[PDB]
Amino acid sequence: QQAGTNTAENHPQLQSQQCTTSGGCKPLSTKVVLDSNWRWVHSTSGYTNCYTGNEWDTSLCPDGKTCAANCALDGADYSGTYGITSTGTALTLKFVTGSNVGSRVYLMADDTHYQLLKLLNQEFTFDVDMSNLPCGLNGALYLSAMDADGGMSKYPGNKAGAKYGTGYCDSQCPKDIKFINGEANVGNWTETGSNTGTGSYGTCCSEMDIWEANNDAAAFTPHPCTTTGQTRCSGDDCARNTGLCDGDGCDFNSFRMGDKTFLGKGMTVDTSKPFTVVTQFLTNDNTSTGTLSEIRRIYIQNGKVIQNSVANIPGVDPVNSITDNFCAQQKTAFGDTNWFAQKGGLKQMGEALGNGMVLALSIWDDHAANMLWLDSDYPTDKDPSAPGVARGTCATTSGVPSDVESQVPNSQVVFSNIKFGDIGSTFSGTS
Ligand SMILES: CC(C)/N=C\[C@@H](O)COc1cccc2ccccc12
Ligand SMILES: *[C@@H]1O[C@H](CO)[C@@H](O)[C@H](O)[C@H]1NC(C)=O
């Protein structure tokens, strides 16, 4: 895609902190950028749309390469069009804004590069307020193995880059992304909703879901893929799980893992109020060159340090962190194939963390599965009493996009106090 000039692109500021054991925490003047799929796409020479509603203009876009040459991504009115605001340290993502639904933004080091986070033997911490983020919605904060320049160096057809939020990939190998590898994804374009569609290509990479949650349920989940870095896929390679990527991931959802009273409204982690989420990425030898061996989670709320809940499932050791053994046990216990291990498990996840990943923040609803995999019974055809089927208490009828978009359009999530750095350094304790 080309870089449009009709609307200035001004990235909201969202400061973060980098932390070391000896030096403490220091601010970084980071910013956020709207993902390219949400932007206006129009002829490079004027104002005519290349994409309107859920279809491309086949005059401007008869093929992927021609489209990318003819068409430009443009600047965004963050608040007015997309419901995205920042105080400078706290990011608010509103659910519906006019006909716009959801958003995803990435953390930038500066105006043309994503912040590249290298979290092996490090920790990531943030605060979240989900008080207004109900059943069926997901406020997600996650890492993807995107390129810092959004693909510009690799793909001559992409002249827009990180400044316009290009180069997305994730473990689901999504085919709804409009620009991949510097080409419009117009092949066999298929409408999937009023403003969305899919093309013949998907875009795949390893993904670490630090936080997928609403006020009913939360999960953290590594998803390794066999490839390294953002990869365009077609055919069977795009297929979730059996293709390049572990689409299911090895998830830790406290409720799915058998503690139904740990996290939710008025629970131990009280989702009716803001709280802090710490995630630590430990290696076997406590070095940044070691193999990722454990992902730990600590919460802080009202100054109380809250350890993660323990798993309580027959055949699963009662642990409270993600390890390769936990993954094998829960997969067997839940009847799920260990695609996670098939793609190389935590070691493979760690190599992606080691090479650096980009931080995404998003609010969304789910047209495929109504978010039931997060907060209800999934699959919808299994007995909810079987180990693993039940992930939350939301009704099995909840989360249909047409419903939540009309019923709770002013839902929002607030992500703040973003910090990363040495293990144990982004937060402190005292007696
Ligand atoms: C934040 C996103 C990109 N991370 C991963 C999510 O897409 C996981 O989604 C999912 C995970 C597992 C099963 C599913 C079934 C239907 C729809 C989505 C599913
Ligand atoms: C790594 O650190 C952990 C604490 O999380 C500690 O228990 C362990 O002894 C350390 N291992 C080595 C090799 O120093």
Side-chain angles (χ1 to χ4, degrees), residues 2-431:
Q2 299 309 299
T5 57
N6 295 337
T7 298
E9 176 63 5
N10 294 314
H11 305 131
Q13 309 295 320
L14 179 67
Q15 187 179 65
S16 49
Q17 303 174 246
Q18 205 145 36
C19 309
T20 57
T21 294
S22 64
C25 302
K26 293 187 297 195
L28 297 180
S29 289
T30 36
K31 305 173 176 183
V32 296
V33 58
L34 184 68
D35 172 85
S36 67
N37 247 48
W38 273 262
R39 295 176 185 277
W40 182 22
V41 188
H42 63 77
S43 51
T44 55
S45 65
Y47 285 72
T48 298
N49 284 14
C50 297
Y51 183 83
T52 305
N54 57 20
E55 295 281 359
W56 296 92
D57 184 300
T58 52
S59 196
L60 286 164
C61 296
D63 61 272
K65 282 168 180 186
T66 296
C67 193
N70 281 348
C71 296
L73 298 168
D74 226 310
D77 181 347
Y78 278 76
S79 183
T81 301
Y82 300 101
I84 300 163
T85 57
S86 172
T87 67
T89 68
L91 178 69
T92 291
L93 306 177
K94 287 186 177 175
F95 181 38
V96 177
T97 302
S99 69
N100 175 72
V101 180
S103 59
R104 178 162 66 245
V105 301
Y106 308 109
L107 189 74
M108 315 199 72
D110 53 53
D111 292 314
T112 58
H113 303 86
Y114 302 132
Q115 176 82 203
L116 199 67
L117 291 177
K118 284 181 173 173
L119 292 173
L120 266 195
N121 189 229
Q122 296 280 280
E123 73 193 14
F124 185 93
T125 290
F126 64 102
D127 291 357
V128 63
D129 175 358
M130 307 189 295
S131 59
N132 298 298
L133 187 66
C135 276
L137 274 162
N138 183 337
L141 182 156
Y142 60 109
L143 305 165
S144 289
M146 291 162 59
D147 298 313
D149 71 351
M152 276 207 309
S153 78
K154 282 178 191 153
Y155 309 120
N158 181 358
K159 310 275 182 53
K163 178 173 161 168
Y164 293 91
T166 69
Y168 187 65
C169 56
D170 74 25
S171 62
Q172 312 296 300
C173 290
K175 303 183 88 188
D176 64 328
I177 305 313
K178 288 173 210 177
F179 290 91
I180 306 172
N181 287 31
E183 301 171 4
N185 191 21
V186 300
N188 246 25
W189 185 258
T190 294
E191 289 176 28
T192 56
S194 67
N195 284 284
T196 56
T198 55
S200 71
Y201 290 119
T203 171
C204 306
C205 62
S206 295
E207 174 184 354
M208 170 69 202
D209 296 332
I210 297 176
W211 185 251
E212 284 185 284
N214 56 43
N215 63 36
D216 187 81
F220 68 101
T221 310
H223 296 260
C225 300
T226 54
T227 53
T228 73
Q230 179 268 317
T231 299
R232 188 173 62 177
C233 71
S234 51
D236 296 350
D237 283 345
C238 299
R240 281 185 70 266
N241 294 321
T242 58
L244 298 191
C245 286
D246 172 24
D248 292 350
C250 177
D251 58 304
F252 197 116
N253 175 327
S254 290
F255 187 110
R256 196 177 186 217
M257 292 321 303
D259 191 333
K260 326 205 318 188
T261 49
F262 177 71
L263 179 139
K265 299 171 157 214
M267 302 305 107
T268 293
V269 178
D270 178 2
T271 56
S272 72
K273 293 159 187 215
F275 54 94
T276 295
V277 178
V278 181
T279 305
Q280 305 168 326
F281 297 92
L282 281 75
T283 53
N284 69 311
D285 73 1
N286 299 327
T287 60
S288 62
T289 80
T291 288
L292 182 67
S293 55
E294 189 169 16
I295 307 176
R296 299 178 181 165
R297 165 61 50 82
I298 293 165
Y299 298 95
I300 314 179
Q301 190 172 44
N302 202 25
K304 186 192 170 186
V305 174
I306 299 157
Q307 301 187 114
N308 195 28
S309 67
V310 59
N312 179 25
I313 303 294
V316 180
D317 298 349
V319 301
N320 73 347
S321 65
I322 291 178
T323 58
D324 283 323
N325 198 253
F326 162 83
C327 295
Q329 293 191 332
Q330 68 99 289
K331 281 315 171 176
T332 290
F334 286 160
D336 287 330
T337 295
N338 200 346
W339 307 112
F340 177 83
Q342 192 187 59
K343 310 324 177 171
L346 287 179
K347 175 177 173 63
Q348 181 71 356
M349 182 82 256
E351 299 198 354
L353 296 170
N355 281 339
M357 295 175 90
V358 171
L359 179 71
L361 307 94
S362 194
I363 187 172
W364 52 295
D365 60 17
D366 171 13
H367 292 80
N370 302 337
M371 222 62 79
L372 307 177
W373 54 267
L374 178 67
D375 56 31
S376 188
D377 311 311
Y378 185 87
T380 54
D381 68 344
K382 296 308 199 172
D383 167 40
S385 49
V389 178
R391 298 108 183 285
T393 65
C394 295
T396 57
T397 74
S398 66
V400 309
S402 54
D403 295 336
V404 286
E405 300 165 3
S406 37
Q407 307 177 353
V408 294
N410 293 135
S411 301
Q412 55 175 44
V413 63
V414 185
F415 286 118
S416 61
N417 199 29
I418 288 168
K419 307 173 77 177
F420 33 88
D422 295 330
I423 291 177
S425 76
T426 63
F427 70 109
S428 63
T430 178
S431 57

